[PDB]
Amino acid sequence: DKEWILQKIYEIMRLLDELXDAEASMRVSDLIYEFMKK
Amino acid sequence: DKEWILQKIYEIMRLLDELXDAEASMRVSDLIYEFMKK
Amino acid sequence: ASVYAWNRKRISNCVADYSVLYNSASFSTFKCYGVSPTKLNDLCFTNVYADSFVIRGDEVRQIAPGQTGKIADYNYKLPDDFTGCVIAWNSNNLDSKVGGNYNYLYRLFRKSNLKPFERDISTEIYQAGSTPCNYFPLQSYGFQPTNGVGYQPYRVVVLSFELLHAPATVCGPKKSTNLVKNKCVNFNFNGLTGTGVLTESNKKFLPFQQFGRDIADTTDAVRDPQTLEILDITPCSFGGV
Amino acid sequence: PAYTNSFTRGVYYPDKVFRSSVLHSTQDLFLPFFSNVTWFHFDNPVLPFNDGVYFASTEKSNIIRGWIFGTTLDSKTQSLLIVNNATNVVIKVCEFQFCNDPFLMESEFRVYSSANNCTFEYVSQPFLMFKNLREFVFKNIDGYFKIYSKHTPINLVRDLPQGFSALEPLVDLPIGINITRFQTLLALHRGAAAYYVGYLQPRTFLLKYNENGTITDAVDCALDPLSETKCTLKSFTVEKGIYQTSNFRVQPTESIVRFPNITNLCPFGEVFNATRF
Ligand SMILES: *[C@@H]1O[C@H](CO)[C@@H](O)[C@H](O)[C@H]1NC(C)=O
Ligand SMILES: *[C@@H]1O[C@H](CO)[C@@H](O)[C@H](O)[C@H]1NC(C)=O
Ligand SMILES: *[C@@H]1O[C@H](CO)[C@@H](O)[C@H](O)[C@H]1NC(C)=O
Ligand SMILES: *[C@@H]1O[C@H](CO)[C@@H](O)[C@H](O)[C@H]1NC(C)=O
Ligand SMILES: *[C@@H]1O[C@H](CO)[C@@H](O)[C@H](O)[C@H]1NC(C)=O
Ligand SMILES: *[C@@H]1O[C@H](CO)[C@@H](O)[C@H](O)[C@H]1NC(C)=O
């Protein structure tokens, strides 16, 4: 699951990167770094 | 663990709903669904 | 009637065309089981309950017996041994609004699976545990008229073809074929059949007499189903050389 | 008990076929000629349907405007009701409850207990609003609902007439629900009428068709021997003579059985009445 969930949530942060909103994209990526930490 | 991170992701896509993308938040919701079922 | 507002609404004692739908191409994802499509326009029953809902264009590809996109895992689920059809098409033409049509919330995830024909209809605010996070993760659709391919709110219908011990197989007629006279034929009326030359028929029936026989149970006088008019039957030339 | 004889009313075209000036027997459900029928005007309680019925009216009245049937006669099992309202008739599978007095210048639908959980409507044109008589019969076969009727003149205010008529189908209904009792459709006016009910049986009849194809009159062949013969020679004109018609078996009574004298043995209880184990 980890590979797939990580791939998909990085796709999410990529999408919300494309649609200008830095704080929320960076927050989702902080949760992904949590997956790195958890 | 709990769905706290899931809830915050919902909050993110709903703030984007309040922004006015009406597609991006939908994608985020789809992927939230994907994680809950995963 | 959306996918947590399903209504098993009633259709019976009525003959509904089904094949005119195919050449119409109003639906766009025709697929079904339990019967050949080109054969349902011939045999069917009572119990024609249906549904018409709104679905995100993605999940449609899995509407099936036992298989179902886990979106409608709660919203709508089917069993196997389902004698009917399930057809669908697009609705992003008007059933979508700027900012997304949050007017509909779709259910997400329960502590237990759902079995078909029964659902859970009351507001769901996801519980992180025994109690929710003590806020709401419940989700509603959003449909901008400029939505994506896999997210067109689609148009969807489900059909039921089963029979209790009641009467009334209410199914398509035979389109009606033009009659012939003065030529021996393997004619076949509404269940009645035989052979012979149909011709004039002076004998005057009464308004409630399908067909006629004279004696020894020989079939010789049929009211045509079309115009109530009266037709004769006569096993025509035959014998031995 | 307000009985009265059923003289000759009570036939009905057994089937939607035509024949031309022939004789034709058939076995179906009818009523015995010269059988009993009950009536009344104070109030008419429920009567049990029991496998086909036959109904009539009085003159100079319409207070009775239909019938209601079923088995348990409540919301448990689907029921039915037949009335008109002077311009468009109604037929339901609607779940109205048998009140203490299911009835209706006008108190429309005052019978109505509950219109809940109803599955089939039916609307159409009417049959009837020193006058006519009501000649109707009802039967339930092959999971079907039936109807047979006609609208004929009537005089002689006292009671039923003589003479003989055919009957007619109205239209068949694929309802299929269960029925084992029923109840008249009457009303209170804030009056003196005649309903008539007789049961049915599987007897075999001998039907004569006129020139055109209308049932003039038939003859049952269980009443008396004269009739019986008429259906074992296939006519109405028995030439002088003698004919054996049928047979008869004087049945037994009680089916006795005998078997050996004592028939009691095999010590069985002392094993259970034993001491220890
Ligand atoms: C019919 O009723 C009369 C009295 O009303 C009675 O004398 C007679 O025995 C009854 N016969 C039958 C067959 O019901
Ligand atoms: C209506 O009656 C049917 C009888 O077949 C029953 O199955 C159903 O539960 C009833 N529903 C309501 C709402 O009364
Ligand atoms: C009810 O209907 C069933 C079949 O439809 C039949 O077997 C039964 O005898 C009927 N009557 C009662 C009282 O159940
Ligand atoms: C038989 O039908 C003809 C024409 O329909 C009619 O004139 C004649 O009266 C009918 N027969 C009798 C006995 O009424
Ligand atoms: C056995 O048969 C004898 C013959 O006379 C009779 O007297 C006696 O009652 C019978 N016993 C029983 C138990 O029937
Ligand atoms: C035991 O004996 C009693 C009488 O003392 C008798 O009624 C009973 O039948 C016997 N037990 C069984 C199991 O029959």
Side-chain angles (χ1 to χ4, degrees), chain D residues 240-255:
Chain D
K240 179 265 292 181
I242 186 168
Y243 309 79
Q244 83 300 345
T245 183
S246 60
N247 302 317
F248 77 101
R249 320 189 56 241
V250 182
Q251 326 299 327
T253 56
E254 65 194 29
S255 89

Side-chain angles (χ1 to χ4, degrees), chain D residues 3-34 36-43 45-77 79-97 99-108:
Chain D
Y3 284 170
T4 312
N5 166 29
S6 49
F7 293 69
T8 53
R9 309 272 166 272
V11 293
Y12 70 103
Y13 284 59
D15 45 357
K16 296 167 282 302
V17 301
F18 167 92
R19 295 178 281 269
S20 174
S21 308
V22 181
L23 268 296
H24 184 278
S25 159
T26 293
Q27 170 55 68
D28 201 315
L29 286 304
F30 311 89
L31 81 165
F33 291 81
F34 297 82
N36 270 335
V37 175
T38 307
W39 60 279
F40 214 66
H41 73 90
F42 210 79
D43 285 303
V46 306
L47 282 304
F49 168 82
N50 187 22
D51 218 1
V53 295
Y54 152 67
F55 184 86
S57 71
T58 181
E59 72 169 26
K60 198 51 162 55
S61 43
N62 305 270
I63 294 92
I64 291 86
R65 210 179 206 187
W67 314 275
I68 53 172
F69 318 83
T71 80
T72 323
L73 196 63
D74 197 315
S75 304
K76 313 299 186 49
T77 80
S79 315
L80 72 160
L81 179 155
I82 311 300
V83 186
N84 183 17
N85 51 15
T87 193
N88 263 327
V89 308
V90 57
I91 300 92
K92 309 278 215 62
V93 192
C94 280
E95 218 62 15
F96 296 102
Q97 278 58 227
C99 301
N100 52 347
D101 173 18
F103 86 101
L104 275 80
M105 183 181 56
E106 328 181 31
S107 185
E108 291 84 304

Side-chain angles (χ1 to χ4, degrees), chain C residues 1-9 50-54 74-76 103-107 119-122 141:
Chain C
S2 175
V3 78
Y4 96 104
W6 61 290
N7 45 5
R8 285 278 290 179
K9 69 173 298 302
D51 298 309
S52 193
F53 59 102
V54 298
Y74 302 151
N75 269 304
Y76 167 41
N103 173 43
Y104 181 77
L105 64 95
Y106 77 106
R107 328 295 207 77
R119 335 201 181 188
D120 46 286
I121 309 296
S122 175
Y141 279 158

